């Protein structure tokens, strides 16, 4: 009531004094420091009357930048720091195919070679971290290792792999079942069936892993504070005192990950 | 100098005291919105007096990080994900260039390796995607390929092209009109007239594209999105 109003007015006075002190301290610094501003980074952006068509189930990290004509299929994911610039031409991302951290997918200027085609990425493909794609036509069920660079005009056929730290030269086709790699990107070896199983399992594991990141990066301020308080409360345990009190403190469901992302599916 | 640093630190102390007072005033009123974990990233960050100087007609992506004494010419562009960190020395970016997506142009972090060479970028210079320019220098109207890894002490002459993914070793000079590629970088072939014309046209194409990207980035922040984020149930 009256006490609450008085305390509110005192708080207003204190806030005004604090802001004045902040301004004075900024003045003494010589106005050299560049003040932090509101985040102007747009996760999804338009360029020329063209909007991305990100599907409902896709996980697009807030630090990612999906720009221009980008079409992304269900179950796929775009991870932190990734850039998909489809301003000049089209970029189509298939279903279940994840583009990993700091990766760049860009499309040529439709005249880099005269007969340029849009960047097409098939289904259930996985692209490693820091990879660079500049006009490829990666077919479905393919693997691109982390750090690999795919120049314009290349096609990665189904069930083919590009070794990490490779450079596939322009107009180079990787046949099915090969592990083309190296800086010239020459033939290394044939793919074994275990490698194919590993590729499919990695794609499915990333589809499974994108969900917790999506559920964590979309929380509100109120939910974040509650989860932080719960995490602090259950960080350390004391079974002896609980046994003395006859209680059993159990971790809330907000701090429990699904068993399908644990190393071996641990129920307990 | 040393007199300026003392005033800078005292200003930090007073600003910290003022922020603490503001937080205390917020707590009396019951508000706790200062606890929000907002991103502290600044597209233009300074180190004491070393502040980037960006021309008005230059596109700098909001996610690009420019730190220290960095000079950007008119018509140049720093695209998304770029990190241009020059603190121990200066990073000079000319007019009409284009630091393309996820590229890195930085200077050496210590004097133990020797003398830190300032990074100089000419005019109409094309830097490929995810390319590292670590204390090198490039003349105007040159091309740096995708994934290139130029090191310090490297001079790339005018009309010189560095092939994609090539790693130019320390203290290497690329002669004018020659393409250097592979690991380590070695002479491969001589540039043709058509490639020179394409290199010249790419700079103008990216300069025009940067204007559209800046126009789409300078629009007022959407209030519908802000309201939707505010109410999440």
């Amino acid at each position: 009531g009256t006490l609450g109003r008085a305390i509110y007015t005192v708080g207003n006075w204190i806030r005004g004094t604090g802001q004045a002190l902040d301004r004075v301290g900024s003045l003494l610094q010589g106005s050299h420091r560049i003040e932090e501003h509101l985040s102007r980074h747009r996760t999804l952006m338009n360029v020329f009357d063209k909007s991305p068509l990100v599907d409902k189930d896709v996980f697009v990290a807030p630090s990612a930048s999906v720009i221009g004509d980008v079409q992304i299929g269900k179950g796929s994911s775009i991870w932190y720091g990734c850039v998909l610039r489809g301003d000049v031409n089209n970029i189509s991302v298939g279903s279940g195919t994840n583009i990993q951290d700091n990766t760049l997918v860009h499309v040529a200027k439709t005249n880099i070679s005269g007969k340029v085609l849009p960047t097409l990425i098939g289904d259930n493909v996985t692209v490693g971290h820091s990879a660079v794609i500049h006009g490829c036509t990666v077919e479905d069920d393919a693997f691109v290792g982390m750090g690999a660079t795919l120049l314009d005009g290349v096609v990665v056929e189904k069930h083919a792999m590009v070794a990490a730290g490779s450079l596939v030269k322009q107009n180079t086709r990787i046949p099915s079942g090969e592990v083309w790699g190296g800086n010239p990107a020459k033939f290394m070896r044939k793919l074994t069936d275990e490698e194919i199983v590993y590729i499919s399992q990695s794609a499915k594991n990333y589809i499974n892993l994108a969900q917790i990141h999506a559920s964590e990066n979309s929380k509100s301020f109120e939910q974040i504070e509650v989860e932080r308080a719960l995490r602090k409360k259950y960080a350390r345990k004391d079974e002896d005192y609980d046994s003395m009190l006859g209680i059993t403190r159990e971790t809330p469901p907000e701090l429990i990950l699904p068993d399908n992302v644990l190393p071996g599916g641990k129920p307990v | 100098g040393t007199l300026g640093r003392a005033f800078y630190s005292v200003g930090f102390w007073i600003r910290e005291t003022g922020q603490a007072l503001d937080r205390l005033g917020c707590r009396l009123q019951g508000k706790n919105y200062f606890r929000e974990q907002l991103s502290r990233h600044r597209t233009l960050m300074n180190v004491f007096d070393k502040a980037p100087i960006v021309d008005k007609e230059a596109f700098v992506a909001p996610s690009a990080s420019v730190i220290g004494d960095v000079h950007i010419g008119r018509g140049s562009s720093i695209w998304y994900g770029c990190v241009l960190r020059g603190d121990v020395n200066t990073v000079s970016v000319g007019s009409g260039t284009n630091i393309q997506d996820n590229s890195l142009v930085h200077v050496a972090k210590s004097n133990l390796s020797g003398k830190v060479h300032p990074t100089i970028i000419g005019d109409n210079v094309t830097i490929g995607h995810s390319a590292v320019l670590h204390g090198c220098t490039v003349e105007d109207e040159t091309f740096i390929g995708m994934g290139a890894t130029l090191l310090d002490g490297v001079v790339v002459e005018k009309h010189g092209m560095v092939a994609a993914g090539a790693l130019v070793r320390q203290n290497t000079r690329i002669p004018s009109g020659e393409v250097w590629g592979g690991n380590p970088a070695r002479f491969l072939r001589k540039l043709t007239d058509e490639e020179i014309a394409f290199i010249s046209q790419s700079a103008t194409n990216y300069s025009n594209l940067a204007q559209a990207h800046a126009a789409e980035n300078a629009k007022p922040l959407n209030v519908i999105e802000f309201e939707k984020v505010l109410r999440k149930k």
Partner: peptide
């Protein structure tokens, strides 16, 4: 919204102000 709602927190603020004022008076009056 010019009202502080938490009654318990308001009493803590009043007690802190009283403690500060009493300490100042104690250091002055004696």
């Amino acid at each position: 919204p010019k009202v502080s709602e938490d009654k318990n927190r308001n009493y803590a603020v009043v007690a802190g102000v009283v403690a500060i004022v009493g300490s100042i008076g104690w250091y002055l009056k004696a």
